[PDB]
Amino acid sequence: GASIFRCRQCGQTISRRDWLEHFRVWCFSLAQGLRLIGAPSGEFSWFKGYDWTIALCGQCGSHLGWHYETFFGLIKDRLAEGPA
Amino acid sequence: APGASIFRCRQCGQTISRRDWLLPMGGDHEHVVFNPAGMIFRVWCFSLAQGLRLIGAPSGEFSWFKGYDWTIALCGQCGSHLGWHYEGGSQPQTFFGLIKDRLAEGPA
Amino acid sequence: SIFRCRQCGQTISRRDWLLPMGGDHEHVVFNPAGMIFRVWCFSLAQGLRLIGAPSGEFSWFKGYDWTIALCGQCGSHLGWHYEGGSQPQTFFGLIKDRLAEGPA
Ligand SMILES: Nc1ccc(C(=O)N[C@H]2CCC(=O)NC2=O)c(F)c1
Ligand SMILES: O=C1CC[C@H](N2C(=O)c3ccccc3C2=O)C(=O)N1
Ligand SMILES: O=C1CC[C@H](N2C(=O)c3ccccc3C2=O)C(=O)N1
Ligand SMILES: [Zn+2]
Numbered sequence: 411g412a413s414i415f416r417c418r419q420c421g422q423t424i425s426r427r428d429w430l431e432h433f434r435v436w437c438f439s440l441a442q443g444l445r446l447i448g449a450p451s452g453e454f455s456w457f458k459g460y461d462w463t464i465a466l467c468g469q470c471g472s473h474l475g476w477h478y479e480t481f482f483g484l485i486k487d488r489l490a491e492g493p494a
Numbered sequence: 495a496p497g498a499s500i501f502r503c504r505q506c507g508q509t510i511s512r513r514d515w516l517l518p519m520g521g522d523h524e525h526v527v528f529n530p531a532g533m534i535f536r537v538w539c540f541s542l543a544q545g546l547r548l549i550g551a552p553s554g555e556f557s558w559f560k561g562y563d564w565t566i567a568l569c570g571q572c573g574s575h576l577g578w579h580y581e582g583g584s585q586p587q588t589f590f591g592l593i594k595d596r597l598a599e600g601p602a
Numbered sequence: 603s604i605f606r607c608r609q610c611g612q613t614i615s616r617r618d619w620l621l622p623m624g625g626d627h628e629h630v631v632f633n634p635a636g637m638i639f640r641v642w643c644f645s646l647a648q649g650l651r652l653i654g655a656p657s658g659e660f661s662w663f664k665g666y667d668w669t670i671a672l673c674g675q676c677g678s679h680l681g682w683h684y685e686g687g688s689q690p691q692t693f694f695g696l697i698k699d700r701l702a703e704g705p706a
């Protein structure tokens with residue numbers, strides 16, 4: 411029952427276990443339904459050698475995590491998990 | 495005189511659980527999940543609960559918590575679906591996952 | 603969006619001022635007489651009248667005292683004000699079903 415990951419606020423589909431905790435952050439190789447905003451930043455990056463960009467939910471605008479450059483680092487408590 | 499000590503069924507007032515019995519499963523008492531019908535639930539985990547009626551036999555299908563089987567938990571007074579009872583697992587063997595917005599919190 | 607008193611329309615609070623106390627802006631609560639309320643927390647509000655001295659008895663929010671909040675314009679009981687805490691020192695718990703949300 412924890413195969414698909416979704417925006418907690420509106421339910422937009424974001425990623426899946428096939429693409430997949432370290433706040434607790436989940437790293438995914440691929441994601442959908444986000445909007446990546448702004449230019450990359452290195453400041454306080456949790457992953458050595460990566461810059462990040464803010465990742466919002468494309469449906470409701472909730473801040474779900476970051477895109478790193480590649481992979482996506484998403485905040486566990488901003489997501490809902492459920493079955494495929 | 496604490497005003498946030500007891501959880502009762504929002505629909506009828508049945509005594510269900512207590513703040514003192516919240517349980518941080520995987521490091522957090524709160525879990526946000528969805529079922530196969532796409533319903534999103536803000537689930538609070540409790541070590542203990544009362545005043546429920548646990549319906550049928552456990553199932554592992556679609557379980558949100560690795561290693562646990564679930565049974566539907568209704569309010570034993572009014573039949574409101576308040577969450578699930580989990581069993582069959584490890585550390586703990588059992589717990590309750592209750593739907594936060596279906597409870598009312600208040601004084602003892 | 604703004605929240606207006608459902609009974610008379612006076613502006614009371616704003617969506618920008620929603621406050622997630624204990625991790626959620628919504629709290630379903632019951633008082634000692636067993637009345638159930640669905641309360642939304644806001645940092646600020648306007649147009650209310652707070653009645654009585656603050657009380658700590660049965661506060662729904664640990665570390666805060668409460669005062670009853672009426673609409674100042676029509677008298678509707680819209681919720682409570684909370685004070686005497688830290689981070690934040692004060693906020694409101696307003697009864698969702700007694701407000702109307704709409705454009706400013
Ligand atoms: N005989 C009564 C009737 C009502 C109340 C009442 O509504 N109290 C609220 C105040 C707000 C709060 O944070 N907690 C409460 O429980 C009461 F205390 C005593
Ligand atoms: O790799 C990252 C992503 C960004 C993240 N981060 C935050 O969580 C945060 C909160 C407030 C202001 C600025 C930041 C920031 O850089 C952080 O600490 N590291
Ligand atoms: O851990 C659990 C509890 C039960 C829950 N569940 C539901 O809420 C549901 C609704 C309809 C068909 C099947 C299911 C199911 O397994 C679910 O998805 N996971
Ligand atoms: Zn969203």
Ligand SMILES: [Zn+2]
Pocket residue numbers: 503504505506507508569570571572573574
């Ligand atoms: Zn009930």
Ligand SMILES: [Zn+2]
Pocket residue numbers: 607608609610611612673674675676677678
């Ligand atoms: Zn009014």
